[PDB]
Amino acid sequence: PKMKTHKGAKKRVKITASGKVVAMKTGKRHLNWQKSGKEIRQKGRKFVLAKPEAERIKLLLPY
Amino acid sequence: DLRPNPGANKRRKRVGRGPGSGHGKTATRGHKGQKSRSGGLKDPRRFEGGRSTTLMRLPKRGMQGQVPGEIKRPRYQGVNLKDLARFEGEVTPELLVRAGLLKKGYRLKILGEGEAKPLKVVAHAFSKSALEKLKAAGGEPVLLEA
Amino acid sequence: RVKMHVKKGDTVLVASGKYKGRVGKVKEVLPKKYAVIVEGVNIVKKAVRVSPKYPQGGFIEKEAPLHASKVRPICPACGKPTRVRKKFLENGKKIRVCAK
Amino acid sequence: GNELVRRAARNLPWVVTLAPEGLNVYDIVRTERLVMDLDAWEVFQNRIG
RNA sequence: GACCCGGUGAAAUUGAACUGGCCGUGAAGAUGCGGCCUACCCGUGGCAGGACGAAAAGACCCCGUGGAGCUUUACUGCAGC
RNA sequence: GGGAUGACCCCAGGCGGUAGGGGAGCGUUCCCGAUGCCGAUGAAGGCCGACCCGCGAGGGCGGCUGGAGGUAAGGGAAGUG
RNA sequence: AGCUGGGGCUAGGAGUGAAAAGCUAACCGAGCCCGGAGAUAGCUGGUUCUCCCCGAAAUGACUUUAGGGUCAGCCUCAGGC
RNA sequence: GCUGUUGGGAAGCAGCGCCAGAGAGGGUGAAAGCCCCGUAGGCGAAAGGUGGGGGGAUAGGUGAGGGUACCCGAGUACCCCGUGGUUCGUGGAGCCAUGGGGGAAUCUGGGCGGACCACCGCCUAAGGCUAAGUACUCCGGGUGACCGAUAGCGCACCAGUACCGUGAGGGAAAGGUGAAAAGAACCCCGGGAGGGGAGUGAAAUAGAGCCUGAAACCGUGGGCUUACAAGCAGUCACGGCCCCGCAAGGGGUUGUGGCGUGCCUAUUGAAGCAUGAGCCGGCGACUCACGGUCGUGGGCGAGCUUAAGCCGUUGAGGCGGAGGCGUAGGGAAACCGAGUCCGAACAGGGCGCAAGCGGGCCGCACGCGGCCCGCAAAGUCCGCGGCCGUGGACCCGAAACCGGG
RNA sequence: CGGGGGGAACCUGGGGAACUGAAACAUCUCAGUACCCAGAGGAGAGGAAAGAGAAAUCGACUCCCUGAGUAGCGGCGAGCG
Numbered sequence A: 001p002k003m004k005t006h007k008g009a010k011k012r013v014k015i016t017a018s019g020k021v022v023a024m025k026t027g028k029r030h031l032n033w034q035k036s037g038k039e040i041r042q043k044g045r046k047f048v049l050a051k052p053e054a055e056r057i058k059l060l061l062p063y
Numbered sequence B: 001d002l003r004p005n006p007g008a009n010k011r012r013k014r015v016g017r018g019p020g021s022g023h024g025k026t027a028t029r030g031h032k033g034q035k036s037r038s039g040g041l042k043d044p045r046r047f048e049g050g051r052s053t054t055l056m057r058l059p060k061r062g063m064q065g066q067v068p069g070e071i072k073r074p075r076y077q078g079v080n081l082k083d084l085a086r087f088e089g090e091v092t093p094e095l096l097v098r099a100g101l102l103k104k105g106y107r108l109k110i111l112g113e114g115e116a117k118p119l120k121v122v123a124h125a126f127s128k129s130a131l132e133k134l135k136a137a138g139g140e141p142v143l144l145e146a
Numbered sequence C: 001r002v003k004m005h006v007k008k009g010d011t012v013l014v015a016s017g018k019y020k021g022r023v024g025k026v027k028e029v030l031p032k033k034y035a036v037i038v039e040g041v042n043i044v045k046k047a048v049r050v051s052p053k054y055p056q057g058g059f060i061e062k063e064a065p066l067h068a069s070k071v072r073p074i075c076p077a078c079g080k081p082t083r084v085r086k087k088f089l090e091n092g093k094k095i096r097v098c099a100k
Numbered sequence D: 001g002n003e004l005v006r007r008a009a010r011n012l013p014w015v016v017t018l019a020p021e022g023l024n025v026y027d028i029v030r031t032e033r034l035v036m037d038l039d040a041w042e043v044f045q046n047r048i049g
Numbered sequence E: 001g002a003c004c005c006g007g008u009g010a011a012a013u014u015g016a017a018c019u020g021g022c023c024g025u026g027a028a029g030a031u032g033c034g035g036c037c038u039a040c041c042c043g044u045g046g047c048a049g050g051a052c053g054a055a056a057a058g059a060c061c062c063c064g065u066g067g068a069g070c071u072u073u074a075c076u077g078c079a080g081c
Numbered sequence F: 001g002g003g004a005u006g007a008c009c010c011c012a013g014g015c016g017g018u019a020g021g022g023g024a025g026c027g028u029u030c031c032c033g034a035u036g037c038c039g040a041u042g043a044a045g046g047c048c049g050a051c052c053c054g055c056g057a058g059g060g061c062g063g064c065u066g067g068a069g070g071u072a073a074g075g076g077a078a079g080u081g
Numbered sequence G: 001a002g003c004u005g006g007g008g009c010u011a012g013g014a015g016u017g018a019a020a021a022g023c024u025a026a027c028c029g030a031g032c033c034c035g036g037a038g039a040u041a042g043c044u045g046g047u048u049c050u051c052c053c054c055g056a057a058a059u060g061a062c063u064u065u066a067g068g069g070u071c072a073g074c075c076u077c078a079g080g081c
Numbered sequence H: 001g002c003u004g005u006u007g008g009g010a011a012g013c014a015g016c017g018c019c020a021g022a023g024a025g026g027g028u029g030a031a032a033g034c035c036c037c038g039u040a041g042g043c044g045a046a047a048g049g050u051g052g053g054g055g056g057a058u059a060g061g062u063g064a065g066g067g068u069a070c071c072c073g074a075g076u077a078c079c080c081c082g083u084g085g086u087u088c089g090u091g092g093a094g095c096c097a098u099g100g101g102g103g104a105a106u107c108u109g110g111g112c113g114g115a116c117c118a119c120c121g122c123c124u125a126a127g128g129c130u131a132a133g134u135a136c137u138c139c140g141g142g143u144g145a146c147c148g149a150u151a152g153c154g155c156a157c158c159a160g161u162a163c164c165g166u167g168a169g170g171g172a173a174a175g176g177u178g179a180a181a182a183g184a185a186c187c188c189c190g191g192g193a194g195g196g197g198a199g200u201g202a203a204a205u206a207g208a209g210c211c212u213g214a215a216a217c218c219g220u221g222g223g224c225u226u227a228c229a230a231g232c233a234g235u236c237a238c239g240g241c242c243c244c245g246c247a248a249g250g251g252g253u254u255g256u257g258g259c260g261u262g263c264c265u266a267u268u269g270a271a272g273c274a275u276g277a278g279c280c281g282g283c284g285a286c287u288c289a290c291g292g293u294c295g296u297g298g299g300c301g302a303g304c305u306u307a308a309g310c311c312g313u314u315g316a317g318g319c320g321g322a323g324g325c326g327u328a329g330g331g332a333a334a335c336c337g338a339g340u341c342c343g344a345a346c347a348g349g350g351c352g353c354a355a356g357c358g359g360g361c362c363g364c365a366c367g368c369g370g371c372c373c374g375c376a377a378a379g380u381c382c383g384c385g386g387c388c389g390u391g392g393a394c395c396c397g398a399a400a401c402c403g404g405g
Numbered sequence I: 001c002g003g004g005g006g007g008a009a010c011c012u013g014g015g016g017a018a019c020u021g022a023a024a025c026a027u028c029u030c031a032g033u034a035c036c037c038a039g040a041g042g043a044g045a046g047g048a049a050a051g052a053g054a055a056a057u058c059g060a061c062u063c064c065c066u067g068a069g070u071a072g073c074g075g076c077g078a079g080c081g
């Protein structure tokens, strides 16, 4: 019956216009105590490939 | 055209795959020949299997919702004057939904590229650069909703 | 009850097979076999004697049944089907032309 | 649409009969010749574009 | 009892068989490959070395994120107090 | 490449194969085609064949048996080998 | 502390037990029947017509993972270059 | 609707007719509109049911002003503790129920709008009843790209039977003579059984558990061929004998010679002394529904398409725009928008956008409009196919777990 | 005057699992399902707002299609909705 939208996905990925899948970099959630600004700074979304193909299949209906 | 004369075109490939016999897909029957594919795998859309799947990701989507749910908010749907320049007179919502754009999606917001046509256009909102384009003799019956 | 057909203990014409043409009477209607008797299809039945009584046994015997369809009634004319008239107080089977 | 005519043909082994508002492709093709009356050629029209 | 005659008349098993020995060879122990040796065809009473003989999808051993019974200062609950 | 699109011709290479992918076909049940067409001068099935067609699955035709059904081209479904 | 007939009572985590986990209708560490139920089985087995073209892998990383998997490597088909 | 003809038998075939609001179907010795039963169309209830569909008859119901403030459902509302219900699993946890404790007011009342408070609103708890639309199918009927006796219900048959078990309960097998019994008088061998004649029939190898009657299996007769040979039983080659046809050629058999390690499965590797199979026949495993993703045959395309349901048919389709996709991308969001997000930044950078035409024709501006076109800008809808998700999801198999007996 | 039992499914109410799924497992899932009990009937239930929730809105209940796999719930896991 009507396939279901994986809400665990719907909560960490925004699927783009060209079809690419986007999510936030992993790291800076609590890791830190002293990481270069460069590292803690360089965290603002990214690509994924062959793996997002899989992602998109879970976000069916919500296109 | 005769009765016993139609028949599909030349591609309705009824030929679905039959599992088999000595020649073609056979025995183990196309795919298989191993084990653990005998009743259905895990996903594998998610599997994976044992180790943490790309779920090592992280909910960004700040705000997923409280418990009463979604807040009754007014949604606005943009519609470039580009398309708007398909007909003339005095375009307005409803006349836009009935057309081929908008439709119940609530409040009308004209903008986008395209060359603004000399005529009155009623909307709930207008983009800055859109309002400009209606410079070449147009309109601006904003607000509405009363 | 419903089990009813076209003939009764009267005169009929065989349209059948071996006796096409032959004409006869009272066919002692069955109709569990939906057949009649007439005067034809009469086979030779062997006999030992169902009990010494009436000793000897011959081969000329009785008349066999005949599918009710193989026969056609006749009266004041020839073959022909049967219709039904109301007799102003009855229901008698009459033939298209004659009358019985 | 004339039931009287319909009733008259019908039993003919070579005749397939229909009411105008029943005009369908399958029948048109299973027969060799098609015969409509003007009042039925209209309903047909009110259905074509 | 077994053996023979008249009577009656089963079974597990069985890919099919036109089913020998020795040295070899081969998935490491071949009637079935090689080379050689032996050997007319078919039975009957006997023996039990082989057909990795039969029977039981090894009870030992390991594997399965299998199962049950049992234990406790393993976990988490519950009755009862 | 011929291209007179002749899907037939010469030229040039290639054509072992498990898991697998791909492409063509054969046959079975049923539906349209069927108020049709085959059928007692014999249906379906069965038993034969040293003949015909096809690379193959098969399709023919013939003799015997059988005794009342069978079902073209062209397509459609699926409890289909 | 005997043996025995007839009439009765106690049963499934329950009975009964001079205690073997014995016995509870010829296999009791949890009876039998029907049902949930087509339990589950990352295991074993089996998987049926024909021809033509191509044709692997048995590696790496991670895996309560190690005879199972996900991504990559290697095969195939369509389109493009 | 008769006749003739073939035939055991016409309904076949033939000649010349006929009915049709009926040419659905079944039967009759074979194939039939006119022989039979029916079919179209049309009639029919004294009696028993059913029955506002249509009539009636009842019960029942028909007001404004201004005063009073009398009454508006109690162990209830309400609050706290323990829980259930809802999408809500302690959550910011409201709402509806309520086992415990405490415990009101009567419209200047009391509940609700997701803690709570103030505004603005919504509604009247603690009494009961109420057709229709909806569900099901033991039963009757009508249909089938449903089955056709290993199928279809477990049962086409004297089946929930025979048999099994103490019991709950389990649970079979088994259909067909022929058109018609015309079911074989009588004679002969025999105790009978069973046969041989005779006789019936179109057919008796339709003779009675009898239509057809395959394969395994058991025999009788014949042809070739075998007791010095040895083998996955075959194959290639000659030769002999037998059989077909005039011949060339072909069929059967096999004496020598050459070459030869069953099938399946599982494996790095099997003739393997690894698995499975006695042989034959029949049953036996990748489907279907709804989603999804590609591909593909079409329709229409700045768009495409309906769902339920309604009207029609009774193998006839229409209507129905609720709704869904698509036409704007960004942001966590407010929001902005061909941009947008981070940023102080017109630095940068992440997502984004920027779609014509190969091109016949032709109004016949020395202008290509724009009709047209692939099927796009570009999508949708339906069909088909591959794979994926949810379902038992390729088929068969546990040891076990739980419920009621 | 009534009641008692029977009735294939269907219906309401009172109680109410587990295998499974989470590739272990306990919250969660299976599921208020299977099953037990009581009751009712050709249906049963529900039913005229101490309602919905944002609309100067609707106006009993039930049933179908959408809304929507949305809003939300979730060891924010499986999944539920």
Ligand SMILES: [Mg+2]
Residues within 6 Å of the ligand: A041
């Ligand atoms: Mg920063």
Ligand SMILES: [Mg+2]
Residues within 6 Å of the ligand: A061, A062
């Ligand atoms: Mg959607």
Ligand SMILES: [Mg+2]
Residues within 6 Å of the ligand: B028, B033
């Ligand atoms: Mg296998």
Ligand SMILES: [Mg+2]
Residues within 6 Å of the ligand: B034
């Ligand atoms: Mg393996």
Ligand SMILES: [Mg+2]
Residues within 6 Å of the ligand: B035
């Ligand atoms: Mg294996």
Ligand SMILES: [Mg+2]
Residues within 6 Å of the ligand: B039
């Ligand atoms: Mg399974």
Ligand SMILES: [Mg+2]
Residues within 6 Å of the ligand: none
């Ligand atoms: Mg009378």
Ligand SMILES: [Mg+2]
Residues within 6 Å of the ligand: none
């Ligand atoms: Mg003896």
Ligand SMILES: [Mg+2]
Residues within 6 Å of the ligand: none
């Ligand atoms: Mg050796």
Ligand SMILES: [Mg+2]
Residues within 6 Å of the ligand: none
């Ligand atoms: Mg040797």
Ligand SMILES: [Mg+2]
Residues within 6 Å of the ligand: E032, H231
């Ligand atoms: Mg050999």
Ligand SMILES: [Mg+2]
Residues within 6 Å of the ligand: none
């Ligand atoms: Mg001996």
Ligand SMILES: [Mg+2]
Residues within 6 Å of the ligand: none
């Ligand atoms: Mg011995």
Ligand SMILES: [Mg+2]
Residues within 6 Å of the ligand: E053
């Ligand atoms: Mg031994």
Ligand SMILES: [Mg+2]
Residues within 6 Å of the ligand: none
């Ligand atoms: Mg090849």
Ligand SMILES: [Mg+2]
Residues within 6 Å of the ligand: B024, F020
């Ligand atoms: Mg292959």
